Amino acid sequence: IHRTQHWFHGRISREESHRIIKQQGLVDGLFLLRDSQSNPKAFVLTLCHHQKIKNFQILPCTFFSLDDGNTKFSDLIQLVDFYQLNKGVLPCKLKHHCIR
Amino acid sequence: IHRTQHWFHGRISREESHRIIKQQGLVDGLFLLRDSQSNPKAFVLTLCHHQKIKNFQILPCTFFSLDDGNTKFSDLIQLVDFYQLNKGVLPCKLKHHCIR
Numbered sequence: 001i002h003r004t005q006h007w008f009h010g011r012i013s014r015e016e017s018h019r020i021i022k023q024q025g026l027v028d029g030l031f032l033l034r035d036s037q038s039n040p041k042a043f044v045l046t047l048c049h050h051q052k053i054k055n056f057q058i059l060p061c062t063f064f065s066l067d068d069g070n071t072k073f074s075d076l077i078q079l080v081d082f083y084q085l086n087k088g089v090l091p092c093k094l095k096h097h098c099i100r
Numbered sequence: 101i102h103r104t105q106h107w108f109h110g111r112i113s114r115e116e117s118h119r120i121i122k123q124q125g126l127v128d129g130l131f132l133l134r135d136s137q138s139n140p141k142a143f144v145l146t147l148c149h150h151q152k153i154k155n156f157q158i159l160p161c162t163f164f165s166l167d168d169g170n171t172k173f174s175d176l177i178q179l180v181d182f183y184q185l186n187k188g189v190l191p192c193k194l195k196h197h198c199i200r
Contacts, residue, residue, distance in 0.1 A: 072185045074185060
């Protein structure tokens with residue numbers, strides 16, 4: 001159900017993700033989620049803060065988490081909804097999605 | 101937007117909430133949410149753990165939080181969904197809601 005979300009970019013690569021975020025200005029809080037190219041059940045969150053791009057692996061366990069289970073979610077929509085309001089282990093909240 | 105949720109008991113007193121939890125098993129993780137009796141813009145999470153009833157004030161910040169703003173939510177549904185999967189400051193996760 002997350003496939004058509006504005007912040008979900010599908011099976012793009014890491015390199016493509018960094019290209020996109022840079023093209024869109026490296027604005028604080030700019031972010032996107034993508035499918036892992038190695039694990040068919042995992043995702044990656046790419047976000048930038050203070051001009052630095054960081055990647056966080058969202059792994060299953062079924063619930064998802066980007067902090068080794070310290071904080072769990074039932075699906076990606078719940079996860080994004082949460083990090084838009086709470087930093088957690090991230091450098092900043094998820095503010096604006098990178099345009100697909 | 102939480103008015104019609106099954107875990108929301110509206111304007112019932114603390115005493116009534118405790119009576120309800122006791123009468124429905126007094127089991128770990130049993131919970132309900134209700135309107136605050138002292139703050140017209142606040143809510144209360146009543147939860148049972150180790151046969152002890154605990155009350156957590158959910159205060160507006162408009163966002164909501166029961167842990168002094170450390171964890172914030174856009175509404176009660178997001179809050180409940182989060183605490184059903186994450187303990188946080190609660191003695192345990194929200195497991196079963198009390199039937200109105």
